[PDB]
Ligand SMILES: Cc1cn([C@H]2C[C@H](OP(=O)(O)O)[C@@H](COP(=O)(O)O)O2)c(=O)[nH]c1=O
């Protein structure tokens with residue numbers, strides 16, 4: 149008889165990190181300027197589902213490095229991620245599924261864009277901002 | 281200066297007939313034995329794709345099963361039967377008219393009759409691929 153052997157599915161998307169092909173090689177990217185709840189926190193599954201749909205349904209993904217630091221201390225490419233023109237970082241925050249975080253000079257070009265989205269999500273008391 | 285946008289592509293765990301799995305401690309792309317699934321730009325591609333993704337993403341236990349002939353195809357893909365909680369994905373897609381039996385070679389054809397049988401049945405119910413008129417006309 150043939151023999152069954154274990155294996156486990158690879159995950160490209162893990163919270164604020166996504167594994168993409170860049171310059172013909174795989175690379176781990178960590179979304180700039182945001183902090184998304186983990187799968188075991190409130191809104192964590194919702195934020196994962198939103199990211200998955202946004203990125204898997206994109207014909208075109210682009211990354212935009214900022215000017216201050218290309219890679220964090222853990223080897224992750226720090227970037228804004230675009231799915232068919234729309235910034236994933238911004239969309240999450242707009243939907244109240246991520247907060248603005250890790251904002252540092254040099255790597256904070258789109259900070260105002262994100263703070264604007266966050267203000268709107270808080271005013272709407274949406275998702276993360278629905279809690280007391 | 282404005283920042284510049286650069287291209288990249290999503291790394292896809294599931295893509296057509298291929299699945300990327302961690303196997304003996306290392307990542308490996310596998311090609312499902314004995315089947316041909318429509319690609320995402322072809323009809324039922326997004327369906328066959330969703331059914332695969334459902335089956336495999338929701339599995340608690342994934343297994344691979346190599347056959348007795350070629351282990352790796354000429355594109356560097358491991359050739360295997362893929363199981364999700366004990367149910368073979370290869371067989372399931374064929375039974376659900378979401379893939380055709382194909383690429384059947386002596387040595388790597390242990391499950392040929394199981395699948396051909398599933399394909400035979402799949403036509404009669406006329407589901408998905410086989411729900412089109414004359415889709416079973418061998419064109
Ligand atoms: C987003 C981001 C995170 N980080 C670091 C800070 C955290 O390190 P410390 O854990 O050592 O405090 C970590 C959070 O990433 P994750 O949220 O992916 O874990 O990544 C940066 O250094 N720069 C950044 O721009």
Ligand SMILES: Cc1cn([C@H]2C[C@H](OP(=O)(O)O)[C@@H](COP(=O)(O)O)O2)c(=O)[nH]c1=O
Pocket residue numbers: 296297298311312313314315316353354359382383388
């Ligand atoms: C299933 C299978 C495919 N292949 C090859 C045949 C096709 O090569 P050609 O492209 O040269 O025709 C290709 C189809 O794979 P995909 O259907 O995943 O694209 O993989 C094998 O060599 N052995 C197999 O067992």
Ligand SMILES: [Ca+2]
Pocket residue numbers: 296297316317318319
């Ligand atoms: Ca195919």
